[PDB]
Subunit: 389 residues, 4 copies
């Protein structure tokens, strides 16, 4: 039992295989399943777990009414065994709040939750199930973080947090933790103009965080982190293949160093990418307007080449079904010589796209890379909204 | 593993961070959640757990009708993983009865329940999950105890118990346990005139229990116990900031050595304080009349100065929401050179304040100290009573 | 871990303290609780568990209809953590069938279930969770066993089984198991004329089993087993305090060596006694006709003196409430120099006594000895049958 | 822990004893039980577990409507503690998909699930709870596998898989795994003309797989695997006692090297046999047309002798009750000098035979061999379909 070192390179990926699917909304039509959103997965030496923000109600409960609302005192980060649906009976409360991240350093799990009023939020940083550190809001406007896993190297786990406007310049910082205790704080530097909801992974001693610019860019920011020196750089994905939502049509040429703007009507969604030269994969919603569909695109040199475009594709969720947030995680403790990319998609059901119900929740699907050429089908949520009417 | 000793000082506390919230009434509107009251938390080397007295029914069950009643043969002390709500599926029965305390000595957990008729109640003392000792009523009138955790030092865990009237002089004893066996029994000594429902914590080799005088006093008794010498003293909180409910307006001067009378309509509520010179915090309901709201007041020298008043505050539960009991606990096994104060508030829903339902139950919120200046918002229960009509 | 040796005497018992209560019918009015009957408790080095025969349905399920029926292919011996109610989610299936026993030898648990048709039943004997031995019916008429725990000594665990009529002379055997394998089989010897449902405990190298004569006697048979020699004797309880149900009024003199007839209208009920000279306690129903109420009577020399009568009494279940089977168990792994007697009462609800519902089920209460003089109250089931109409 | 080696012979079997029964449909009438089909059991050093393919809904859920359908993105292989019913709360997700196998090699469990569209399905091979290998369809037509446990020897676990028509010649392969990695792939050889849903067990260094010829034969194919050389042969069960469903009347002689055709209206059902000279047992449905009843027949030399017929029988499920799939498993880690045959019967309820409900599910019964002559009765599902109307 030792601190995780990000020594290994990323595995070659040619297609994506199914890892897990919880069918939460289908099950929760009758069983006692908690209302969630903002899910993710995170692993540790023993296996992987699902994580999400509970709304502190079940899906069939009367309190599901009004769960489109983002921030309340009734939310918490919960975790559970991968593949089960989240019930009041099988879920571990990691921390209390309405924005989270979590990662395992090889010894113990760090979980962070922000809570409080918009003008005076605070994070509590847990390690090994105990609270270690608290961090007050520095800009007085919804202190918040990744909504997917963080990554650790030799016990140091960088976390990206933002405080400030969601629709204008904000105050992002990279906080470097060890055993839950702040080792260093950096202000965001570089050419990314706005940072939300980073999706982060490690390979060859480098952590890359692929984020949501909610202010300008339909191209995604990328923060590159050295967890040994505890330093970073930022810019945008170079590729012309735009991967936020909403977004305009892909232009001739992307831009490494500035946002590519446009699209309607929404300013962003959490997303991810794996960036490894020829071995690069970008996720995005199929729709360039709405959180519908989900596709993986193999885009060689997406990180460096403004003319890069897709050479493969795999549909994860068909464009007749609702998607949601997406994020990266890796089973860093697999018995492999390489770290194999994995990702999840949040399958949002209910408001605001399905207004015949009073609630908003999600289910989860997760996939990992394969070097083989595997066939694909759509892993949509599967619930019938009529049954909830 | 070793027996806990209380040699560490209390941590400096400048504000309170969220530790846990179970949202039990919201969840229990639809899921199978047990009806409880008299909750608390208690920790051990592995972590902290939630505790409460079940009523032996679920919240939506027909048998929730009538659960304002305090003492029945269907009640039990239950414990569960911190943050979950208490269901029939995730709860451990610690002991049977209708008044309890529990605490971990570093090796094993002691749990004590009282049961029986009013005139012939008895305690059963459990240690490591096995029954060790039984204690028959000495005064023939509802033998009872703290309703929050006890504290242990070098194997010795003092517990404060009362037997006798709730509205007149009663027979309080301090019973000193080791591995669930009585080491010594003391009658209450000193200037506290009536003792109920002590909230106790250790620091600096000293256990302080802040109690409820249900006879005359709107100021809270304080018992100070030396667990090495197995002796105690008692008096009242000196501060003019009165902390029982009901209470009169705060007077110009408190009284260290007599009850301050007044207040309407209720004789008392379980509460707590942390008393550490300048580093002193008093909890109380916001209402001076009713169990609504909850505030933390930093009252330097509350223990010693009749003129001591607040220098800061933090609303825990707004005064538009119901509160209930509150009590002290500490994670004495944290990785810290000091013991950090924690507390909970019982958020009572249903009767008698909400008589549109037939039941009485509660949810839990718990917070711990921070040296930082954290923002705050109200952590009220969050259930809509209309949904239960 | 080591094999249990019955090296200690019984503890002195002056009164009985509450050990556990599951409130299963109150909870199972709304939560998913299995229909059961024939419960017991059994301990091991880690603590004690509850056991019962499930009916393979929940209480509120439609399949609860008709659960007065004793023997179906849907029944199983389930065990669960002491104090919880038995749900589909917290119960361990020990074995399949409609009559059982179970005991822990200090290394692993042996469980035995009988199943099959009346004329062709069979036992399966499990050890450490694996099936070891099978035993075919020898008399072609409902091969069956204790319905409470067995007892082990130096790895030898005797079990009493009957096969044959319930209303005439039957073929009872004592089978001595070690690690689930048969060591020896004895035909019943001595003066007991009919044996059902033995309740057994150990002390001082002797196992005593207090049974139900369903044929003739209102006095209970007593089998005395030597688990080292693997031999036994039998007779009846001597006391004039008759403890089966139904029974006649207590005569002025018992009978050590023949059944005392009389009683209407029930031929018997499972019960128990602790027999230890002056330290002897007899349980029975308060009603002499019906499974109503439950009392403990201290009857010095009940085992040897036909004139022995009660010197003290404790009501366990008042005679306005339903009782049921009762049986013995001991926490042989307690940290005491003596083995402390415990018992349980099955609190039967529904048919036949409560015919306004379609089901028959039970809850459990359990108590253990105290040397103190504890007060008592009634530990009845607590469910309101009207809520199930 | 060490790799399992198939060193032991089969145990003599003269009758079958009950091992487990989950009563899932009875319980699931009211409790939250997943819809399933294609169940099995599989053991490991600690005991045995139940397995099945969930439909990603509860039985009383609205999503149970349409669960006759075989292949959806909402299915998964789930496992749970033997004898419990499968709920969302007690089931482990082994892998995602709509065809499976699993087996333990003595060190860890391998589980394999196929998912995807009919023309582009893929297997994912898990070991120790982590994905190891992926296998794309080779024939573009529902890559699929055993639907009961595989068997391992010295770390090598062969698995039979088919891809191609269900009603014509298909491409079957035997894939030999070690630690979830492919050691060798063989095309099916020998005289079996069509292979589906193999039921496999090991004894004396040989693995025997008794399968389903869904194209022609009402006699069952038998694949014999040498797990050290990683080679096999195939033919049919010799015996005139035909054991697929549907089937014609048993002919005067069977045929070891070609299918015996006929029967109406269905082309096959998954089944099993244990083949060990005299000590040979064949399962089959009692009906020759429908999945009704289930019987075990002792058919000496069924593997070699075309004139072999039954010398004994045991009814497992009477012919007034629905059966379903059946399969082999063995507790290879029992404390016996032989490996004792076990099997399960899938008890299918709902569509198509019970059209008054919208769903299809099942419960499980499992039995193992006994050398004794045990009595038997019918272990039918036991649910009342009227309660679901
Ligand atoms: C970001 O978050 C942080 C932390 O969550 C937060 O920090 C707080 O900042 C405020 C100032 O903005 C601090 O407030 C101070 O509180 C001091 C003590 O207040 C309590 O006690 C008062 C005295 O009570 C006694 O006597 C009265 C009158 O006779 C009697 O009613 C009482 O029963 C008792 O006997 C009391 O009046 C006061 O009441 C307020 O709060 C209660 C709930 O507790 C509420 O019910 C009341 O309605 C009322 O709101 C309170 O209970 C106080 O002495 C201090 O006042 C001095 O300084 C101010 C300048 O700020 C002067 O105006 C004043 O003259 C005083 O000399 C001041 O009010 C608070 O302590 C901080 N808390 C912490 C934990 O740091 C920030 O506000 C947040 N930022 C944003 C933008 O939200
Ligand atoms: C605090 O709680 C404790 C714990 O429960 C409690 O302590 C008990 O105190 C009472 C006295 O208050 C003690 O009662 C004694 O019991 C003796 C034995 O009684 C049993 O047997 C009697 C005879 O039974 C046989 O004979 C009759 C024919 O005579 C026949 O019907 C029977 O079938 C049988 O053959 C029997 O009469 C008696 O019945 C009582 O109790 C049963 C429940 O078991 C109930 O259903 C009946 O309605 C009835 O109440 C019982 O079954 C008894 O010998 C003894 O009598 C002497 O003492 C009293 C004074 O106490 C004298 O008045 C009398 O003349 C005798 O000299 C007495 O009844 C009991 O043993 C204590 N138990 C323990 C565990 O200590 C405290 O009272 C509680 N305090 C408060 C304030 O509530
Ligand atoms: C077994 O399943 C396999 C796994 O899914 C499958 O293998 C797949 O085979 C298909 C057909 O051969 C291959 O498709 C090839 O894909 C590349 C990549 O195409 C993607 O990118 C292009 C270009 O996008 C950009 O420019 C367009 C054009 O101007 C803009 O609109 C856009 O915004 C971008 O700037 C895009 O046009 C493609 O569009 C397809 O896919 C999406 C979903 O991702 C649909 O929404 C869309 O309508 C259309 O169907 C696509 O996004 C392409 O260049 C080649 O020409 C070819 O199309 C897959 O790559 C291959 N996948 C893998 C993982 O191997 C097998 O086909 C399947 N077998 C069977 C029998 O079903
Ligand atoms: C305690 O329970 C014991 C456990 O069950 C039980 O012991 C059983 O005792 C019975 C009665 O002695 C024995 O029966 C014997 O069985 C053999 C084999 O019978 C099976 O095979 C024959 C031949 O089948 C083939 O040919 C026929 C006709 O041409 C075809 O129809 C069939 O397809 C085959 O091609 C078959 O006729 C038998 O049919 C019976 O059983 C089936 C269920 O399997 C029913 O559907 C059917 O109606 C009929 O009842 C059977 O399948 C036979 O050859 C002997 O002559 C004799 O019948 C059991 O073998 C024996 N079992 C064991 C495991 O020991 C005890 O009886 C019981 N005690 C009490 C008191 O109940
Ligand atoms: C869902 O929640 C909304 C918001 O609380 C409920 O709408 C309120 O209903 C109350 C009681 O009738 C009104 O007095 C409020 O003014 C309404 N508020 C708003 C914002 O509309 C609605 O009733 C709930 N629906 C259900 C079915 O519970
Ligand atoms: C809640 O509990 C009360 C008390 O048992 C019930 O009130 C009784 O109702 C019974 C049955 O109709 C009447 O005979 C009595 O008049 C009532 N007793 C008292 C003290 O009021 C009430 O019915 C229960 N309510 C529900 C909905 O279960
Ligand atoms: C069960 O599932 C079927 C299939 O989805 C449902 O049938 C549909 O019902 C809707 C609403 O009545 C109709 O618009 C469609 O025409 C039907 N579709 C088909 C394919 O038949 C059926 O309603 C469901 N039944 C229940 C009780 O949920
Ligand atoms: C507050 C800004 C932030 C990022 C743009 O909004 C997020 C957008 C969300 C969204 O676009 O769906 C939902 C998130 N729950 C919300 N985060 C919080 C903490 O409320
Ligand atoms: C019996 C006196 C005691 C302290 C005043 O009453 C308490 C008051 C209560 C209260 O004020 O809410 C509830 C407690 N459940 C009750 N305790 C018992 C054991 O019934
Ligand atoms: C079959 C005789 C036996 C003992 C008299 O009957 C018992 C009586 C019972 C009873 O008196 O309540 C219930 C038991 N479940 C039953 N046992 C079985 C195996 O059916
Ligand atoms: C696809 C052919 C295959 C074997 C003949 O059909 C099976 C028949 C079934 C059956 O006969 O009941 C149900 C199985 N779930 C199905 N398998 C799959 C993967 O769909
Ligand atoms: C108290 O516990 C601490 C930490 O285990 C230990 O170092 C110290 O010696 C203890 N003091 C006493 C007097 O037991
Ligand atoms: Ca954007
Ligand atoms: Ca008071
Ligand atoms: Ca009798
Ligand atoms: Ca066939």
């Amino acid at each position: 039992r030792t601190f995780l070192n990000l020594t290994k390179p990323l595995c070659e990926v040619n297609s994506w295989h199914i890892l897990s699917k919880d069918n939460a909304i289908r099950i929760g039509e009758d069983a006692h399943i908690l209302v969630t959103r903002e899910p993710y997965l995170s692993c540790d030496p023993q296996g992987c777990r699902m994580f999400a923000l509970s709304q502190g109600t079940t899906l069939r409960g009367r309190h599901a009414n009004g769960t489109i609302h983002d921030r309340s005192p009734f939310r918490a980060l919960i975790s559970w065994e991968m593949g089960q649906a989240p019930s009041p009976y099988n879920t571990r409360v990691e921390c209390i709040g309405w924005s989270s991240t979590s990662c395992h350093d090889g010894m113990s799990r760090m979980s962070i939750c922000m809570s409080g009023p918009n003008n005076n939020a605070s994070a509590v940083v847990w390690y090994g199930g105990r609270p270690i550190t608290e961090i007050p809001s520095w800009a007085g406007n919804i202190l918040r973080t990744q909504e997917s896993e963080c990554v650790c190297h030799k016990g140091v786990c960088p976390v990206v947090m933002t405080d400030g406007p969601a629709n204008n310049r904000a105050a992002t910082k990279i906080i470097y933790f060890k055993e839950g205790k702040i080792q260093k704080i950096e202000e965001l530097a570089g050419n990314a103009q706005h940072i939300e909801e980073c999706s982060c992974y490690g390979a060859g001693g480098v952590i890359k965080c692929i984020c949501r610019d909610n202010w300008k860019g339909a191209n995604r920011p990328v923060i590159t982190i050295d967890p040994e020196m505890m330093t970073h750089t930022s810019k945008y994905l170079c590729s012309k293949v735009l991967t936020d939502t909403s977004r305009p049509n892909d232009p001739t040429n992307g831009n490494c160093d500035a946002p590519i703007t446009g699209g309607s009507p929404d300013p962003g969604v959490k997303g991810f990418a794996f960036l490894d030269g020829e071995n690069s994969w970008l996720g995005r919603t199929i729709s360039k307007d709405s959180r519908s569909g989900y596709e993986m695109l193999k885009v060689p040199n997406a990180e460096t080449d403004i003319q890069s475009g897709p050479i493969s594709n795999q549909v994860i969720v068909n464009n007749q079904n609702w998607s949601g947030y997406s994020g990266a995680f890796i089973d860093y403790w697999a018995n492999k010589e390489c770290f194999n990319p994995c990702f999840y998609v949040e399958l949002i059901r209910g408001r605001p796209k399905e207004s015949s119900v009073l609630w908003t929740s999600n289910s989860i699907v997760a996939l990992c890379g394969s070097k083989k050429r595997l066939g694909s089908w759509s892993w949509h949520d599967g619930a019938e909204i009529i049954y909830f009417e």
